Design a protein around this ligand. Structure first.
Ligand SMILES: *[C@@H]1O[C@H](CO)[C@@H](O[C@@H]2O[C@H](CO)[C@@H](O)[C@H](O)[C@H]2NC(C)=O)[C@H](O)[C@H]1NC(C)=O
Ligand SMILES: [Ca+2]
Length: 270
């Protein structure tokens, strides 16, 4: 999941015309003003996003906008450069996996409403088909049309906690008892130094720490299980009172040396 983002950067429509060659706003004949020339446009932008299209008919908004459609607020007059493109950005959410391939249709529209909608109010129209991967980097596009020049930019970003080219790999970094890991560029758990395991919840103990009789709750340490000792927890403790004997790799035992017997190995056998 994530969003396809489009930010208008500039439109240049110096003569305040429509694509059909007429003026924006009210026809000058119907105006009761001293204004000379065309009235200014009231420009907004409509984005139609859809699957990658292999023919000219696909570059129309008549084939539908499966990936979403939106219209900005009025962003300015006939020509303007947006100092802060983010405020009027078009954000189209997508669910499941990002498609990578797409076709967009971007229209500039004169929002002068008299009989309410009409297609004569198209100022300019452009289309772009391509393949884009999730990234905060913008792709800048520039359309020098017959009537207006539109500069805009697009990007795709995964929803928060999602990664990978598909925006479906989940990762949330953790630094507590249940895990110690950062998130990689594709959502991989990157264990913090000294940790391992499925959730990077296992401390990596001191080098040489006995894997069976040693443990650690913090990296680089070696704590001994009952009846074992030494810096590496590899030395068993003999049963208290054991004389001529050893633990033989088992905690609290007294296994006799040759020619000694008894529970404490203190009986000379010969
Ligand atoms: C990023 O997306 C790709 C696309 O699926 C993942 O790579 C594929 O899937 C397996 C995982 O089971 C990878 O080991 C292979 O290298 C890829 N196989 C094919 C046929 O493309 C990749 O795993 C994703 N990254 C993460 C962290 O999930
Ligand atoms: Ca023009």
């Amino acid at each position: 999941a994530g969003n396809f983002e489009l930010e208008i950067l500039e439109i240049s429509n110096t003569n305040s015309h429509l694509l059909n060659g007429y003026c924006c706003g009210m026809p000058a004949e119907l105006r009761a003003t001293k204004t000379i020339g065309c009235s200014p446009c009231t420009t907004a932008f409509r984005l139609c996003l859809k699957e990658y299209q292999t023919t000219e008919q696909g570059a129309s908004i008549s084939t539908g906008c499966s990936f979403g459609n939106a219209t900005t607020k009025i962003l300015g007059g006939s020509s303007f450069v947006l100092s802060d493109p983010g405020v009027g950005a078009i954000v189209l959410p997508f669910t499941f996996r990002w498609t990578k391939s797409f076709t967009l249709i971007l229209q500039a529209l004169d929002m002068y409403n008299t009989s309410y909608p009409d297609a004569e109010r198209l100022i300019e129209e452009t289309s772009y088909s391509g393949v884009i991967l999730p990234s905060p980097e913008w792709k800048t596009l520039d359309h020098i049309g017959r009537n207006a020049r539109i500069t805009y930019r697009v990007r795709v970003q995964c929803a928060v906690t999602y990664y990978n080219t598909t925006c479906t790999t989940f990762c949330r970094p953790r630094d507590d008892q249940f895990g110690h890991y950062a998130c990689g560029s594709e959502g991989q758990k990157l264990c913090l130094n000294g940790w391992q395991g499925v959730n990077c919840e296992e401390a990596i103990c001191k080098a040489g720490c006995d894997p069976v009789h040693g443990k650690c709750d913090r990296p680089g340490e070696c704590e001994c299980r009952p009846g074992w000792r030494g810096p590496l927890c590899n030395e068993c403790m003999v049963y208290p009172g054991c004389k001529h004997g050893s633990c033989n790799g088992s905690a609290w035992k007294c296994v006799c040396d040759t020619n000694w017997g008894g529970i404490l190995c203190d009986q000379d056998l010969n």
